[PDB]
Amino acid sequence: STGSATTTPIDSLDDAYITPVQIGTPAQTLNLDFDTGSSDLWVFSSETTASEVDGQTIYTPSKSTTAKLLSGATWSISYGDGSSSSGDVYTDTVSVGGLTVTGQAVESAKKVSSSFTEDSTIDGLLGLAFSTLNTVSPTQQKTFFDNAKASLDSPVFTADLGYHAPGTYNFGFIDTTAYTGSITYTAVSTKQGFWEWTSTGYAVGSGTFKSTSIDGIADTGTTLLYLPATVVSAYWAQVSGAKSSSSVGGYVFPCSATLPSFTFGVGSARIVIPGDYIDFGPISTGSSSCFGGIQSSAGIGINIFGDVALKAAFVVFNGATTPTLGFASK
Ligand code: NA
């Protein structure tokens, strides 16, 4: 089998991407944030504290003839950005882009943190990291991909995120028309539960490539590119007036600037992030200070190749017995 679904930016900055997901019978379609940095499929629901729901579409398990309580199971998650959610668990039929999994764990939120409430466009998350990170207790549950894997034509999914435009998540096949040149594959460590890999270096603009190993995670659920402070300083030094602002919480730059590109290495190959991809706009409405899309990972404890990086590439998440990642230009 295969599946293919379009993923759509939630706003004009590409702060996140939402993908429609069919849950239950008859289908209830929710727009979920596909997150290769976590491993829980959780949704706003008829169980979510009423004051914590503000415009989201909810899953109502009592209206699904295929829903079944997963008795005794609970979940609770906290994300790198400080947000969180928790609740109980149902199994139900879940379909993405025509690919169906029966008996998928659907984690129903009883509580969500304010950042989720405040974002009316995201109805929940669909985790695509390794199932070892799934938070359900006392019986850990499998991700949608892990459940689908054996049935897929090939045990892979691909992320093709757009810049200020929709893109595509495919399951079970490589669309050879979706990228240019060849795909370069690179090794993955699953020891921390992530799609963790090692970039071979970077360049700023038209500058020389610096060969240096940068361990990090491929994370579709993180907006920005988080790299070591040395690398990030080298980038922003090429933008007149850019500076790290402790009060704003990262690098800012004059909105009048023209941003240079940023290149990262994948083996001997190179992925170029255009400068425009690094602009996250005014820090507040009407400000002439703009927020940068490349930020320091110092304090986070891991480097994160978030959407800023991933949307410059066609990315293969190869879930074979020994997983690997692939990157192509597009
Ligand atoms: Na922000």
Swiss-Prot record:
Keywords: Aspartyl protease, Disulfide bond, Hydrolase, Protease, Signal, Zymogen. It is an enzyme of class 3 (hydrolase). Residues 17-328 form the Peptidase A1 domain. GO terms for molecular function: aspartic-type endopeptidase activity. The active site is at D35, S199. It catalyses: Hydrolysis of proteins with specificity similar to that of pepsin A, prefers hydrophobic residues at P1 and P1', but does not cleave 14-Ala-|-Leu-15 in the B chain of insulin or Z-Glu-Tyr. Clots milk. Disulfide bonds join C255-C290. The keyword tRNA processing does not apply. This is Endothiapepsin. It comes from Cryphonectria parasitica (Chestnut blight fungus). The gene is EAPA. The chain holds residues 90 to 419 of 419 of the full protein.
